Amino acid sequence: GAMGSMERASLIQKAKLAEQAERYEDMAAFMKGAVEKGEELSCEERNLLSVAYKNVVGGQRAAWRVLSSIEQKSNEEGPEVREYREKVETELQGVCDTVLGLLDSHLIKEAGDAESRVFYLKMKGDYYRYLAEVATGDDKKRIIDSARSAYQEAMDISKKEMPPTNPIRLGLALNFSVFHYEIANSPEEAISLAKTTFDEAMADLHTLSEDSYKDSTLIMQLLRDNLTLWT
Amino acid sequence: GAMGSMERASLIQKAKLAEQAERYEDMAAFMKGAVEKGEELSCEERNLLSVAYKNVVGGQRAAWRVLSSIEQKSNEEGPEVREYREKVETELQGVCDTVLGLLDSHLIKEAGDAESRVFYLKMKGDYYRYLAEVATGDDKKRIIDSARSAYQEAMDISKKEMPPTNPIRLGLALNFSVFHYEIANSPEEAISLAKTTFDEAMADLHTLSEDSYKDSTLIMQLLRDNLTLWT
Amino acid sequence: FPATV
């Protein structure tokens, strides 16, 4: 594509520079170019891809929420607020479609190790969840089921192949719990998942080095924060 | 251009929505479309134009400074850092050229009141100053002189037509003082301008209502902050 | 909003 003439190593180096410069749209474009080289991504490279797109879509989601709130207030008791919310929504859908397209061509198909496969299936669940946040049409239930299916496959692999303190397994559980609460209208499933994940991780902390303990406890605190918000 | 089919009032309304959503690139595109309608801008509309482009170029300047620092450290004691700094620099130059083009076609030519003419000439000085921050070639001295000339014309009008507490006059003086210090290598001129501006505004505060007093003292505090940094 | 990573 647009980054087709740049070396893969140069795209990765530029993604790291764009991260330092807080240029997340450029970071995402460099990482999309690196994925399109066709080689599998290392752990560090998967995290650069996810940080780039999370920041891009996070800005879009924050803008969409502001616009949706203004639109809802305008329809209580011109077309511009709806038109601009729709423009932001279409741009957000475009970014989610781009990420889902990279996962389907061909990141997931080539991911055989649990660390890579769980990471990409978590990403697939997350980007379908962002599509679900703005969905209204005939495909809304199918978008929610696509998020659920990706998260469930990731969970099934993570439970068989990773320890309960693995940060990818923990982050998957945190996000799938938020999917249950916010998207699937299943608050009890959300709370049960967050609580079991927290408790199973706590019981495995004794096996960890100081650095791994820090990584796992950081995500466990997010599970506890959600449990405090919900209970 | 791109916004040619949208009503001027709809572009202004969407610029205000983009401001609330923190979508400054969209805000700038909507305001560029509103300027291109050919009508003069009101005070509120001039401030939407300036807020939009200040945020866009501010992000670019922050990224350029990060990249320039990394590049300088790499050349002490591959081409990627230079290439990416150049890409950000060219994008920054493009935004400054777009703003300067709007001022030249035809915002300044049609601005006859001091409030509008001083505001646009301040903007012209500011965007030439941002070009000067990254300039190296044969035209560097001419870019600095273009910033100086625009600020000087704005100052000459402001001193004849505005009270010393007018926030536009104060902000012009604050920025022209920073031009002297950071671009023209004239720290004594920078300090003299900030001090005289502060003192002349202080002596005129007695004429102001509570709301005008708040607007003027906010900028006077920035003059004092720069004086504290420089002395 | 709840926390996600």
Add this chain to the structure above:
Amino acid sequence: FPATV
């Protein structure tokens, strides 16, 4: 960096 508006 110094303040500008």
